[PDB]
């Protein structure tokens, strides 16, 4: 039933420019495993990363709080260039995500992240693609998440946007500040599909973050405050809930560099 994603033409392009980071839910190493660090995914099939032969879905699957199975796209890109927009396209079906979160500990821990724009560190700093370095702050620019319930909305996708470039980590000395208390916009994108897939396109460039869902722009947000941070894409599952396992089927996942975003 399970095959190597590298065998499937529709995923080959994105995999050539990615590595896989995958937690080991019962491993005792305490740091995630990493694979295809050279962008070569031949032979890679795991419980947490495979193609389902029948549907040809790329499956990311992961038990346990804060664990993840995700590809990390190589390019550390600048978000402030005119006419250069970095684009992550995905067509996904989350698999019974309400079941995944059903045994969680508290209402806030009821989320699953599918797509991210994270920072690698400063545009000022000389470190290569594919890794992180000086200037890194421990917050992604945006996560597209499923949330079971928020603000009366049940089973919607949300964009969790970091709305400043401040380090608000536990060792920052900043957690009490206004910037840190008010650091995020959490904005509702669309309910999860009743049937079929949900199509996402993220464009980052020209000092903008654009997020489309089913070809309709849901987020169109100036990100000039982030433009000192080299940024990069991740896609898969990453768990903000306890005591279960998440699963997402990606029927398409693409990465490209465009002269302009699609705004509609
Ligand atoms: O749950 C929280 O205390 C805050 O989480 C923040 O998102 C975290 C996220 O859960 C992962 O740890 C992540 O990738 O790092 C994130 C970050 O932005 O630092 C935000 O959701 C924040 O609103 C929460 O209060």
Numbering used by the authors: 39 to 302
The study reports:
AlyV is a PL7 alginate lyase identified in this study that preferentially degrades polyM when presented with alginate, polyG and polyM as substrates (the detailed enzymatic properties of AlyV are presented in Supplementary Fig. 1a). AlyV mainly degrades polyM into trisaccharides, with a trisaccharide content of approximately 82.9%. Unfortunately, no sugar unit was observed in the structures of the AlyVQ139A-, AlyVH141N- and AlyVY261F-M8 complexes, and only two sugar units were observed in the structure of the AlyVR91A-M8 complex, which was attributed to the minor residual catalytic activity of the AlyV mutants. The crystal structure of the AlyVR91A-M8 complex was solved at 1.90 Å, showing the typical β-jelly roll fold with two sugar units bound at subsites -1 and -2. -2 subsite: The side chain of Lys209 formed two hydrogen bonds with the hydroxyl groups at the C-2 and C-3 positions. -1 subsite: The side chain of Tyr207 formed two hydrogen bonds with the C-5 carboxyl group, and the side chain of His162 formed one hydrogen bond with the C-5 carboxyl group. For AlyV, the corresponding two peptides linking the four β-strands were composed of residues Pro117 to Ala134 and residues Val183 to Leu210; thus, the structures of the two peptides of AlyV showed long loop insertions with small helices. More interestingly, Lys131 from AlyV loop1 formed hydrophobic contacts with the sugar unit at subsite -2, whereas PyAly loop1 was too short to form any interactions with the sugar unit at this subsite.
In heterotrophic bacteria that use alginates as crucial nutrients, alginate lyases depolymerize alginate into alginate oligosaccharides (AOSs) and then into monomers for assimilation into the central metabolism. The overall structures of these PL7 alginate lyases are similar, showing a β-jelly roll fold composed of two antiparallel β-sheets with a deep cleft. The noteworthy structural differences among the solved PL7 structures are the loops around the deep cleft, which are variable in length and sequence and involved in alginate substrate binding with the deep cleft. Structural study on several PL7 alginate lyases reveals that two loops around the substrate binding cleft determine product distribution.
